[PDB]
Structures are given as structure tokens and as C-alpha cells.
Design an enzyme around this catalytic site. Sequence first.
Site, short mmCIF file in Angstrom:
data_model
loop_
_atom_site.label_atom_id
_atom_site.label_comp_id
_atom_site.label_asym_id
_atom_site.label_seq_id
_atom_site.Cartn_x
_atom_site.Cartn_y
_atom_site.Cartn_z
N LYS E 154 3.80 -68.14 45.89
CA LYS E 154 4.33 -69.49 45.93
C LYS E 154 4.86 -69.83 47.32
CE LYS E 154 8.14 -70.74 43.40
NZ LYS E 154 9.00 -71.30 44.47
N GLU E 180 19.74 -72.37 44.95
CA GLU E 180 19.01 -71.28 45.59
C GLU E 180 19.82 -69.99 45.57
OE1 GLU E 180 15.80 -71.61 46.55
OE2 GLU E 180 16.12 -69.45 46.44
N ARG E 181 19.20 -68.91 45.11
CA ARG E 181 19.78 -67.59 45.29
C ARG E 181 19.93 -67.32 46.78
NH1 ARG E 181 15.72 -67.00 41.61
NH2 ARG E 181 16.29 -66.36 39.49
#
Lengths: 35, 81, 158, 466, 456, 477, 128, 187
Positions: E154, E180-181
Site C-alpha cells: 500500500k 496514525e500509529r
Amino acid sequence: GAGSIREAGGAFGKREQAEEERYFRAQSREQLAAL
Amino acid sequence: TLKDITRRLKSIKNIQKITKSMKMVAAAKYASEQSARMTAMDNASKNASEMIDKLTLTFNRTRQAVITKELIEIISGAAAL
Amino acid sequence: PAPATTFAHLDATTVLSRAIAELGIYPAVDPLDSTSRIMDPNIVGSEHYDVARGVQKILQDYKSLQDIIAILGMDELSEEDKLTVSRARKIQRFLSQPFQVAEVFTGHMGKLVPLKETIKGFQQILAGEYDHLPEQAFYMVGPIEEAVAKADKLAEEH
Amino acid sequence: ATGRIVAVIGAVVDVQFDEGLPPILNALEVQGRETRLVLEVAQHLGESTVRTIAMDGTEGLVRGQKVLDSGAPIKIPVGPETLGRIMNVIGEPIDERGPIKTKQFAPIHAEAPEFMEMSVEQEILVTGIKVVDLLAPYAKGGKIGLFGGAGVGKTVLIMELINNVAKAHGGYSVFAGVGERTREGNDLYHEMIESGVINLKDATSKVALVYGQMNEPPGARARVALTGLTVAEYFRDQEGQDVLLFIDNIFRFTQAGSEVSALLGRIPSAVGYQPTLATDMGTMQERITTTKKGSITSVQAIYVPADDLTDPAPATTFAHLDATTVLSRAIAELGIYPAVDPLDSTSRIMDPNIVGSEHYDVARGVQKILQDYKSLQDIIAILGMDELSEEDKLTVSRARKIQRFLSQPFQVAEVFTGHMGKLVPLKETIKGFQQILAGEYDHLPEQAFYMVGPIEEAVAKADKLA
Amino acid sequence: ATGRIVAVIGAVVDVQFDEGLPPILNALEVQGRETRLVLEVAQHLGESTVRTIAMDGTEGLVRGQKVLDSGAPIKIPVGPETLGRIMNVIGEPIDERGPIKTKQFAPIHAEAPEFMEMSVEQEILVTGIKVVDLLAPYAKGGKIGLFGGAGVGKTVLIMELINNVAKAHGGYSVFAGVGERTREGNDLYHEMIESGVINLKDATSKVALVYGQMNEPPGARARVALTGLTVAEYFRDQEGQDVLLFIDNIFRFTQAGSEVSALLGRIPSAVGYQPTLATDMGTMQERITTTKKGSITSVQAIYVPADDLTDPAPATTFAHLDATTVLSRAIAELGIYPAVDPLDSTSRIMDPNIVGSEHYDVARGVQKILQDYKSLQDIISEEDKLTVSRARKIQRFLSQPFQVAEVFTGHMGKLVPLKETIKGFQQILAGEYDHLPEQAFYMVGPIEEAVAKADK
Amino acid sequence: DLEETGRVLSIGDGIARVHGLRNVQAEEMVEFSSGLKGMSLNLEPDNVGVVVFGNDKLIKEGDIVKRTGAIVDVPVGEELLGRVVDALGNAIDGKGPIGSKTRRRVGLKAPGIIPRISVREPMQTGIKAVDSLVPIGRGQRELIIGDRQTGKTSIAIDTIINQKRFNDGSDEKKKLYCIYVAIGQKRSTVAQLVKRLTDADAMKYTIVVSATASDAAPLQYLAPYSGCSMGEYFRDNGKHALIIYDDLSKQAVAYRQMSLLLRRPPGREAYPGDVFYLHSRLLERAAKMNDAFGGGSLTALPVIETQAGDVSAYIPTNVISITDGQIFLETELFYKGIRPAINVGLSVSRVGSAAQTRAMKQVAGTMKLELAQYREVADAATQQLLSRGVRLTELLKQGQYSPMAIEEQVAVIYAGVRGYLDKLEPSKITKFENAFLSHVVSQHQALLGTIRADGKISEQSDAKLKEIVTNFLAGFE
Amino acid sequence: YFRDNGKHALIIYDDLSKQAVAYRQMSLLLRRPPGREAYPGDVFYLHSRLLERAAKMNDAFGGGSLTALPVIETQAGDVSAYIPTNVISITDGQIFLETELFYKGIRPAINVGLSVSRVGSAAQTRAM
Amino acid sequence: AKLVRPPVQVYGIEGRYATALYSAASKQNKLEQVEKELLRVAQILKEPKVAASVLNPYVKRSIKVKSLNDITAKERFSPLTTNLINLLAENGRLSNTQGVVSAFSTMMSVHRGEVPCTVTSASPLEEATLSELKTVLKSFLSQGQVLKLEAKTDPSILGGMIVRIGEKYVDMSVKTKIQKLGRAMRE
Ligand SMILES: Nc1ncnc2c1ncn2[C@@H]1O[C@H](COP(=O)(O)OP(=O)(O)OP(=O)(O)O)[C@@H](O)[C@H]1O
Ligand SMILES: Nc1ncnc2c1ncn2[C@@H]1O[C@H](COP(=O)(O)OP(=O)(O)O)[C@@H](O)[C@H]1O
Ligand SMILES: [Mg+2]
Ligand SMILES: [Mg+2]
């Protein structure tokens, strides 16, 4: 879902129970007479 | 009922896998009754996956409805204070 | 939330099942859902632990085979698998026991089975030492000597 | 007693009276309106303030507007002058035929008949519909309820019952449209005129019509069933007549209650329904009854929300009915019409001492074989037809023939199928189902039983197909 | 105007203004803090009090603490100087490279373009990727739902889209990491640095990063998408570009809105989402469109809760998606890159009235031959083998080497034009290459490369 | 002046609590200092709750609210034809102000029982499947229900385009003025739709009311009633209007938002209790008026989007219990290439069958019967039924933005139901159809014209049709 | 403390379901608006700000690290519950355990089809 | 309309009416007069006939507000106090009146700089040490405040003194001292 079909009841769990009982009453008859 | 639908889904997914494997075994042995068994178990697996798709739709509807019903119970109990 | 919260406060849960009570097996203890923190080979001994794990494994395999039995029926099973199903049904009946307090419910007499007798009987069923006896010989008996006597009587009648 | 509006919230209006607070259920007339705006008192809030439900739209209401107390509940004209007329929730004529010149007016709120006024007689009411006549027969003077989801055939069935029972009826008849389509009311009015049942030229009309339809605010939809009840109660009590009362739809009554329950300040119950759902329904339904002063046969169509038969409103209606016809969408999509679920419709005269042992045994056998087919459905669905016994195959064959034979063409449904409607006598129904059960037609194709009348038309259709 | 904190309940802060209340959606700066704490006004409660959602943690706040009205919504720096940087929801640099030095700031709350500013005709955004351009093209100004998560490339696809749009169309990209991590944010930053998309030395970066991490309060994660969209809106309206906007994940945008709405005391809707679910999604998504100056095309990573496509969050997102790109692991296991599932990726503009009769016919032929091939795979005659051969070749030819992967594989990166894509698949379908081996179509650009590779 | 003026007490959740306005009426339009408007929803002893038709961002506490003295109304008239307006009747197409001299309340009640008459005139959609199997009459409410991207808007747009043949003619009782209400759609989609109608020259008799996905929830809740008032202007003045609500699922969602933010008890799927009344009071206003009231009509085509094809949900069932039938669009048929994806076995028209023209009845009774038999079948008689059903199914497919005159549909369905296509293999039916139509359009305008004038197929015209179809099918591939 | 001083720590929260339950009790008693399953609106924020603190520092910050192994008990295997959904969303992978595998004799009862590690081979020695 | 907010805040109905009246009185510089008038109107309120007529729930609000109106006109009050009483009677918050009153009172309790501070001791301590603490404590104050001491005597502290100066709180008691020593002994 190992015993999913007979834990659900219905035709496929009741027919399974009937088949098992048929086979093993046959085997218990042919096991008792041989005693 | 969510638990009824989960039991039935599990049962029918199991029936589908068993008929699929029986079809593969019959298509191996097919190398007149064996072809008949192959088609019979193929149709059984098709019908099982059809029922699985319908039951999955029902299951998703029912679990969304259960979450909403519990939220409404909590909100109604909190608004009474 | 109430039972689920209770579970973490216990050392040895016994979970009773309605699916088991409707088979007629009492007590309706679910063997694949009951737990004990002393079910440890370093505590109960390796023989006890191995017998318990073998019983649980054959019952799980019986579960897994019952789907196949529902579709293909019983006559199209392997021979190892018919043996599994036979020993599993026998073990199911042998986990049953007549209670002294249920003498009115059953009409039977109470039996109090010692520990080594339990381990020995289940080891003998798992080994195949009673493949020839019927399964109704293990229903509602105490030690395995009673299963043998019941088989002999059930035969001597018919 | 003159009060003033202090709050307006949708259909709910708070009115403040300095002298002479009006009792609960009184009617109040708002002053300064072109049409008559009537508010029914629902609650005393203290501080000389009452909360009320409006019978029309509350747009244009201002805080401080005057309100007069009539001194009595909503009063509608009752009498033989209501026959052939259309009145709205408050008894105004809405057919432009001028005023309704009765001699007496009744309040739409009355107590239900006492326990000693009840009647126990249970004659059967033959309709000409095979599934109803066989499995769940209606009773004269009884309460009939037609359950069903959206578009499964409640109105077609109630119009077929108007066609079969109300046309040849001896007494009077009242139709109350409660929260339904206005064009359906226009259809029914002109269809009753062209059939001669409503006579615009003399006093020979036999049907009264009350209408608060789905364009009306919730207060009108909540009280229009009461208005229809009131007309029917006059015809029962004050003339001893045998009345037919058709309500469509009674669920809307309950539904309208919900819409005001929020604004009346009540904690909701399950599914957001009024906490007073069962008591409101019972207060309404106990007036729809037979007494020993006169008989009322009631046919009520009951909408089932989202096809959920355990919804509070239909589930609560179930206990008020003597006979229930439960239509199914699954049965309708198979093309079986009427979509009556044979394993869900009941009746209380389905007792061998009432219908005779022959009728009772035939109905029971039909239901048994249908239940057996229903049991087999799973095995049939996955493994197919080939894995059944010959006994299971024979019961499936007969059960599907009986299924199709339960369908029937209606006279009111010709216009969208072309097929002439059939009206099957009761003996013919018992006979045909008895014969399909005995095995006298195991050779005919199952499509020969579909959409016919008596069993002779089934034999004729089977011939024509070959 | 200056108010004072009167209540602190979690991430909700009530601020009282003795004069001049700030409008709703205005940004308020809490005074006397080691780091900048911004509050976004959400309601006017009466008695000169406003309720606000906090953009950072609220520990150590004191009742009576002074708060300053900024007189606008949250304003972020917009411009080319945002390219290659990372900023958070309030436009602060979080990459430790100093201040983001732009000349213009923009509020993150703006209205969608008026009805008379819309482009009346749909057109294709050419990406230079063969499977995308052919089977499920991207509409210029549309929303693309990217399905498939880890282990299917991705990030390589995102970077290749950034690079291809910068090269072909001359438009920049924004990447909004909603929820977002932090680990994966660091990973993506460095993957973009290595593949050349971000450049820390000269001014040739192609993407602007906007991160709102998972450890941030729900308001921050709810507005980070609008922050990225404001950067993209600058690049469209002021530069006249064809911008890409990546939103990862869009389900996290919905969940942040849900949490914010629950904190503000609102009655939850069905399933459990905010009562304003559709208008939240709408006021965000309506800004991603084609105006008369440029366009914003948005690729949005989709997560489906419980794999129920009728769930309110996916079902509200799907109302806006103009295309769907499904990265499948079964296709990646076959070595085919990108792992775009060719039968499950859909597009609304795959319509002979929009893409042309020829493009549409080629795409429908390719799709039917792939369906036929899997149909034949089910059982494994005369021409069944010919369809098997041509479908194997079609499968291999959908693959393509990406420029952003040149330092790994060594091969050169192909940006195939749309005409070349149509013509190559047309020729493969008409049988013009039944003599070349099937391995000659693997990882090439146009069809000329396939014939030159079969020459080997 | 606390009688015609108020000061906003609080704002948030879309609802403004306003102090004052002691003379305001219930459901009256008020106006804020920021140019925004609102509806007085809750009159309370101490305050007014005002539903804002716009963003709360524009209203602050302390802002002054004047009252307009008018219950919420929109401009109506023919000056709206060709214009794109928002939910309040303000132009959004940039062509100047609407020159309307008449206004109409959006919340008027529907005509009662006596003002109506049964639906008798046909509303020609131009779609073969609809006009033959699911006919619509003027004054009807027909639901277009289906999943996402199954072709609902395409059906509505084809109807609007189809009305061009009648609106150019000289028969005024045959004209139909179209209203398209967009509720929660993308704004780019509405702009593309307006261009599609301008290319087809269909905007000159179309009003577009647009409350899109970025508009406030009160505007999307209001847009259907504004459009309905615009159409009632024609219904009450002797003319005939069509109105499409695209769609009512999104209006129901917007109303559920407004209700949950007002803290009203949620019901099934958290919808309010009066989400049925929301749609029933709206779709009751589509009516056919008898000749004492002018004889005009208003036809409604509400659109409903289902999830995974579930038409037993709450809002689908509600709208099915309101309307006069439905057109089910199936995803399975759409993906298989059958377009329009009409499920002809579930699509029904309760009141439109009495409105079908005579020639269409002549061919469509047979067509319905044969498709029914084909549905029941799937020997040499059942294989004939399969062949005929396959041919008729291929004949019911249709392209986009090209609706057909009723006489051409009659000719094509004639060629199909009389049996002339039975030896053509199905993959050519479509081709044949185009060819056949082209021929009948160029060389045989007089047969089409006489079938149009008679409204029926005379036996003279039946003989001409037989001759033409035999002579064409001869020299065909 | 260890993560900051160049050392490496591992932390096991056994388990986070019970911490979520405790926080829900505190919130419901403080009259904070309840959400799905009566959990407050910031229970995701709770677990996410707990779990983002497990990091790997670069050598400019000492090179230390903190590894988190949160534990979650699902009810009847329902990973679509609220708190399991949240923590599955937050973490870098999952080790899923089955009771059927447990009683089949497969112990540790790890379900390999469902388990995942989005770090993957980058956390393995070359031999493994 | 910008308010003049008091130095201390009271919340509830009492706080809202007291803040409204404080703000109204500070705009006209009539604070002391309104204070004296609320003291008097509250002591009027506690009249048994008047309390019985004002708490009565079935009396129409019209007659009740007329009664409060004339019984305020019998006193010749300021327009601010008259309008306050009519606003309380018109809204039906007359039951809260004294509360409101005391709220306003306690508001001006800090306006005069009167700082409330209570000294709890074991046994009633005599006035010498009391003036000692007077002087040593008024050192604790800012510009222009005066002490309000309330010397309480609970011997359960058996020594020392617990001093609550406004919201400051010093524990010189011997019980806390010995318990602190004991906790150090055990911990
Ligand atoms: N009769 C047709 N023939 C060919 N293509 C069609 C036909 N009808 C629709 N389509 C195609 O299907 C596409 C989507 O259908 P459409 O937008 O009209 O329906 P929809 O259900 O309203 O979709 P949405 O969910 O966006 O509201 C159209 O753009 C069009 O390309
Ligand atoms: N007895 C019937 N015969 C044929 N069609 C029927 C019959 N009953 C219902 N239907 C079909 O189902 C549709 C719904 O009818 P209706 O009774 O008005 O629905 P509802 O249950 O909502 O009142 C009818 O228009 C008709 O198409
Ligand atoms: Mg009906
Ligand atoms: Mg559409």
C-alpha cells in the site's frame, strides 16, 4: 465450530444424533449377544 | 436472536466445508455414480454458501440492532436522572 | 457480565451444561469448559494429567467428527474414527455418576469413586481395554468394576 | 373558562387557565383560527396549566392566544344520519354534502362495557376465503386482526372482506381509516357509491366512514379510531344492530401515541414506545366488543413494523383478537395470495365442538403436513430433494399441493391480474383439502392447484395443462 | 478577547468570556502552558460561556486560567514550504526541522465550492499505472477507496501515485495520517525519504505530511483531515494544480468524530456513531472536488468494521467514493505488483460516455477474459486453452515496475500513458501476441517492452 | 422590543434558544442578523427553539433575531422553471433572482378525499420496462428503491428527458413540468445532472432544488417540502407536475440527526417516532385532482436506497406503506448487464395499470404473461418458454439518456411478443432492436403517427405492423 | 525509565479489559456521557495514550526501548466488541488464542491463521 | 450587556439571582442600599403569615405577585429591590428568596474585605491569646482585609489549634502531630 452442526439443533443435528444412536444400538446389540 | 444466528451460521459453514471436501474426493475418484456424487456435493456446497451469505446479512443486521438497542437502554436510563 | 466477572475470582470452575443434561448425563459438567489451576502435571502427577488431557482430546475429536457424521453418516467413517467415536461415547457415559442426593431422581444408589479408581478406569477406557463392552455399561456406574458387572448383567438378561 | 396558550411544541400545547381548569379529556377551542382547532386535555401540570394534544396542525399558534373550554370531551354526531357520510376526527363532514343532522352527539371517550355485559356466543362467519375458512375461521361478533408488513396484502384482504361480508350484510357497517392513504379513501368512497352501498340521493346508505389519514397530525391519528368506535357503539347500543367495524390501520393509532409521548414528557419504554402502550391499546380495544345489547364484528388491519412480529404494538394487539390472520412476506414472494401464514394464523372457534369434527380434523391435518414440510426444509435446501425417504417425498408433494391450493384469486384483485375472483364455500374448502390430504390428486401437477377456487377448477386446470 | 477556564471535564473545556464571545469553530489559545494548547469552540452554552474540545491534553489546567480568542478557526501555514515537512492538526512542525516558513495561513474550516464553481463534466485522472488506468480509472476530483492493508504494497502504491502525479500532471500531494500509529508514521516518513518523494536537502519534495497520532485527543484526530485538506486546497486554488490527498484511515476520521460527539454529550445514533455522521463526512468530503482552477483527487484508505459493509461508517463513506482499488494478498503471492485485484477494483466512470467506447470495450474484454480464466481454473477444450493463455498474459501484463522501487529491484520505473495501456491490452486481446511467451509480459511498461523482452 | 425581536440565548446542536419573540407564531420563519433564517419550532414559556437553516458557525449568543411574520414558505411559479435553487428558493445557478410573485407554505396539508379522483392519465417515462410492466399514472407515488449504484437516478433523469416530446407540443393537457429534489447528494453530481438536462434541452421545464451533502441537516430536511410546494403550484392551477425526491433515505438521516440533537427518544435504528409522518405528510401531497379543482396532478417518484438489498428495513417499509407501488432495482441484475436492473417480479404499480395507453396494454398484457411464465419455468414447451423469456428480457434492456416514444416501445414489444424474434439468437436481439427501430422511424412514420393518434393498434395498423416486422426480419442477419 | 536510559524493558498489562472496566466505573459515576457498552467517549484515548508509549528510540536518544504486551479477554471469541476493537486497532499485531485448539492438544493454543505481527521478519534473527 | 461580576461566585438559582442583582446594583452604585433592603425583605419573608402565603403551591401566581408587590410598596424600597422581588415572584422562585438574599449578603461579605477564618481549639481559649492571633493573623492578609474569627472548641484534638483562614488551612493540632510521628514510626 467443531460440534457446530449438532449444537445448532435442527435437521442436520437431530439426524446426526439419530444416526449415531442407530449405529451404536446396533453395535451394543451385536456386542451384548457376544458376551 | 444473535446467538441463534451464530449457531446456525457455524453449522452451515461446517456443512459447506464438508460438502466441498466430499466433492473434491468424488472428482478425484471420477478418474457414472462418481460424477453424480460430484455434482450432488457441488450443488450442496453452492446452496450452503448461498445460505451462508443470507445468514451473514441477517447476522450483521441483528448485531447492529443489538448494539443500538443497548445504547438506547443506557441513554434512556441516564436521561431519567 | 456477572458470570464473566466471577470467572477470574475462582481457582477451579465447574461449568454445568444443558446440552449435557439433555443427554441424560449427570452431573452435567462440561468437560471442555471446566478448569482447575491444579490441573498441572507437577501437582496431580503426570499420570493424572495425561489421562485428563487424553479424555479432553478424545472428546474434542468426537466433536470434530460429529459434523462429518452428520453429512456422510456413520458407515462412511474411517476405522480409527469409528474407534474414536466409540471410546468417546464410552468416556461420556463414564463421566456420569449416581449421586447419593439424587437417589430420588434416579432410583440409583450413591457411589463415591476414589481418585486412583477414576484415573485407572479412564486410562483403561482410553487404552481400548473395554472396546468389547457396550456403552450403556458405563452409564451411571462408580468404578470400572461396576461397568464390567453391569455389562455382564445386561448380557445375562439379553 | 378561558385560558391562554403558553407553549406550543409540535402537536402538544400548554394552556394556562386562571379560573376554571378543565378536566382531563375535555375539548378546548382555540380562538382566532380559520378552521376549528380543538385541543384535548391530557395532563394537569399544576400552576393552573394543562397540557393538551391538538387535533389539527398547530402552525400559526401564538403564545397568549385565547382558548375556550367546551365543558365536555370531543363530541361527534351519532345516528343514522352518519350513514353514507364521511366525517373527520372531530365529527365534521368532509364530503361537502353539508352538515350532519343527527339528533344526538356522543363523546368519543367512554368506558368499556362491564364484565356482566359480555356475550359468549360464537357462530362462525364464512368469508369465502379458503385459508381463513379452513384454518382460522372468523366468528360473528368477534374480533379479527389482519397482521402484516408493508405491501403484503392487508388492504386487499380487508377490501375482499368488505366485498364478501359487508355487501350481503344485514345490519350497518362502519369503516374507520386510521393513518392510511387518502387516495385509498377516495377509492373506497367512490367504489361504495358505484356499488350502491352509499346512496347520495336518499337515506338508504348502509355504511358510515371516518377518516384520519397519514397526512393528519398525530393527535387526529390518535383519536380517529375512537371516533369510528363511537359511531359503531351508537349503532350497537342505541339500536341493537349487528355492526361491522373495519379499521385500517389500527397500528397507526399506537404509532401516533408514540409521536406525542415524547412531547408529553414521558420516559420512553422499549423501541421508543409510550410507557402507556398496553393500557392505551386496551382502553381503545375493550370498546370494540360484542355485548348482549348488540353485536360488533371487527376487522382490524395491523401493520407490523419492519416485518417484526414481536414489536410492542403487534405483540400487544395479539391478545385482543378472537381470530388473527398473519400475512407473510416470504409467502407473498412465492406468489401465494392471500399471503396468510397457515402456521401462524389462529382462531378461537377452531374447536371440534364449534366447527365439527370433520372441519377440525381436516384443518389439523393440513397444518400437520405443512409443519412436516417446514421441518424438512433444511435437508431439502442443502442436500436437495433426492436424499429424502419416499414417505418424506410424498409428504413434500402433498404439502406443496396444499400450499398452492391455499391461494385464491380475489374479486378485488382482478384489476391487477385479470383473473376472475373465486368465492369458495366452506364445504367445498373442507372437501378439497380433505381430498388433497387423502391422496386423491397425487397425480396432478402442483401448479394446477395455484390460484383456483374449488377443487374442480384444479382438476380442470390440470386437464387444460396436459 | 480574553476568557477564563470555568470547567475541565476530560478533553472538554468550558471557557467563560466576560465580553465578545468567540464564534463557533474558533480557536482559543490557553495561556500559561509549556506547550501550545488549542481549544476549538463547539457550542455557546449561555451566560457568556462556550464549550470547547481540546486539541491536546488538558492535565494541569486550572479553573480561572486565562484563554485567548484568536479570532479565526485553526489556521495552518499553507504554501510550497509545507512540502516535505510534517505538521500536526494545528499547523506546527513535528519533524524538528524548524519553523514552516510560509507567507500565507489558511483556516482549516472552509465551505465547499459553490454550485457554479463545479466542473460539469467528469474526466479521468491518468496515473500512469496500467491496472488502475484501465480497469478502474480515477476521476479527476473524485474519491477513491483503497482497500487492503498490510503486506500488499500500500505504501509503495501511495508513493508511486505521488510520484506519477507530480511527474505527469505537475501537482503535489498531501498525506493526512488520521489516527496514525507513531511507529508507522515514522516508518512512512523514512520510506518516503528513501524513495525520493520527500527530500530533506533541496526544495523538490512532492508531498506534505500532516499527522494526527493515536495518542492525541479525539478533537485533534477529528480535525487533522481538515488540516491536510486545507493544505491541498491551497495547492489547488492558489497554484491551479491537480492535487492528490491521501487520507489514512478514513474510518479513524469517523471514529474521532464519534468520540468527539459522545464527549460533547450528544445522543448516539444507530450502531453507535454520532448523530451528525453523514454531515460530518459531507462537510469534509465536499471540499475534495474539481473547481475551475484545479482539482483535488483523494485516495482514502478504507477500514470496514467487523467486515460488515452495511455498517454506518463504511456505508456513509461509500456514498462519496467514485472509485475503489482493492489490494489483494492472493495477487501479491503471484508476484504481480501492484497487487491490485483486477476483478474487485471498481470505478464509476468506467462508462462509455465518460472514458470512451474503445477504452470501455478494452476494459470489459480484459475483465471478461479474467473471469473466464478463473472459471477455467475451477475445474483444472479447444479454445479454453487459448483463453487460458491470453488470460495468463493479461495477468502478467497488469503488473508494472514502479519508479519509487528502483533502489530495491534495480529495474527502471515505467509511467505508461493511457493510450499505450489501452493499445497494449487491445493487442493482447486480439491475439497479436500469442507467439510470445507469457513471462515476457511480467514487469514491463508498454507492449513494445514486452516484445523486446520476448526477443531475449 | 421583545415582541418582534429576540436575543439568542444559546446556540449549538443546530438549535438556537432565543429569548423574546413573544409574538412569534409556531413554525414561523425568523431571520438572524447574520443573514441566516430559521423556523420557530418550540415555543416555550421562556424561550423559542429555532431550527437554523444553515451553519451554527454564523450565530453567536446575543445575536438579534427578527421575525418575518410569515410561516415558512418558498417562492412558486413558472419563474422557477429552468432554475437551480436551494432548499429555501434562493437561486444558486448565478442567473439572477427568481421573479416569483407567489409564495406557498412548505407545510401545507395534502388534499383530502373529495378533491381527488382516480389516476387515469399516463405519465410516460420512456423506459420500456417501466411503461410496459410497471406503468405510472399522473397523480401516483411510485417508489424507486434499490442499492447504491443500481440506476435509480438514471430512471428519474430519463423520465425528465422523456417529457420533452410533450412539452414541445401544442396539447397543454399533455405537458409535464419536472422538479428534481437532490437531498444529500454530492454537489458535483447535481452539477453534472443539470448539465445532462441542459444538453437534452430538458431544463426549460425543470426546477432543481438542491440540498447537498455539505448543507445543514435542516436544509436537507426541508428541501422535499420546498420542492413539493413548487409542484403543488402546478397541481392546483390545472397543470401537471412530476417530482423526484433523490433520495428520501438521506432526508430521513438528516431528520434523525435533527431529532437526536433535540434529545428526542430514538426508536428503531435510532430513528424518531415520527419518521413515518415525515414522509407520509410529504408524499400525500402528490395527488390527482378532479375537474372541479382544476384537473391537475402531481406525480411523485421518491427514491430509497437499501443496504445489501434489504427492503424489510424501517425506512424502506415506511415508504412502501406510503407509496402506490415500487420499482425494485436489483444489484444482481445490474452486475449481469441487465439494465435497467428492474426486478419485474417484485416491481408493482397498483394504480397505474388503469392509466396505460391502449396499444401498450395490447402488447404488454402478453409480455407480462410470458415473462411470468419464464420466471416460473427457470420438454419442447418449457424450452419454448425459456426461449421467449430470454428474448423478452433482452428486449427490455435499454441505454441511457435515450427514452423512447410510446409508439416505438409498442412496435418493439410487438415484434418481441408476437414471436418474430424466436429464431434470432439472443445475443443479437439488442442489435436487431436498434435496427428495427431505425427502420420504423425512417420509412414508417405514418404507422407510428396513427398508432399515436388512435392510442390503440387497429387491425389495419396490426396488419401494417405484421407486414413491416416480417419484411424487416427477412432481410436481417 | 529504562526506555529513556538506553536500556530495554518489556511490560505486560494483564489485562486491559479490566482497566477499561475500572475507567468506565469512574466515568459513569462522575456522570460523564456514556457511549457504546456504556464506555466513555475517551476509552480509545485511554488505551492509545497508554500504548503509544512503547517505543524504540534511535541511538541519538540512547537506543532504549519499551515493548508492550497488553492482554485482552474476548467474550466468546468476539473480537468486534468495543475494547477489543480499540486495542486491536492500536497495536502492531496480535497473538490470538483458541480454546478449541487448547483442548485439541495444541498448546500454546496459538491460532496461526489469525495471529499477525506487522513488524514481522524485521524482528527475527537470520537463522529463525 | 456586559455584567459586573462579584468577587466571589455563587452557583444555582441563588447564585444567578444574586449575581444579577449585584451586577444591577454596581452599575448604579447602590450596593449598600440594596444590601440593607435585602436584609429587611428577608426578615419580612420569615414572617409566619407571609411565609405561609408565599410557600403555598395552590395560590395563583397572579395574587401572590400582587401581594409581594403591595407588601414591597408598603416598605418604600429601591427600584432594584422592588424589581428583584417581582422577578422572583413572577418566576416562582420565592422559596429561594432568603437563599438568594444570603448569597448577595455573602457576596458583599467579601466586598468589605471581611475574610472568614475559624480557629478550632481543644478548650475555649481566653482573649489575650485571641488578640495575639488577631494581630499575627491579619499579617496573612492582602491590601485591606479584616478578620472574622469564630473560635470553636472541640477537645477531641486534645491540643494545638486548627486554623482555617479563608481557604488556607494550618493544622497545629497535637493529634495530627502525634499521628504523623506514629506513621513515621510504622513507615
Ligand atoms: N440503463 C443503463 N445503461 C447503462 N448504464 C447505466 C444505465 N443506468 C445506469 N447506468 C450506469 O450506472 C451508473 C450509476 O447509476 P446511477 O447513478 O444512475 O444510479 P444510483 O442508484 O442513483 O447511484 P447512487 O448510489 O450514486 O445514487 C450510471 O453512471 C450509469 O453509468
Ligand atoms: N390477494 C392478492 N392478489 C394479488 N396480489 C396481491 C394480493 N394481495 C396483495 N397483492 C399484491 O401486494 C400489493 C400490496 O397490496 P396492499 O393490500 O395494498 O398492501 P398493504 O399490506 O400495505 O396494505 C398489492 O398491490 C398487490 O400487488
Ligand atoms: Mg394498506
Ligand atoms: Mg443517484
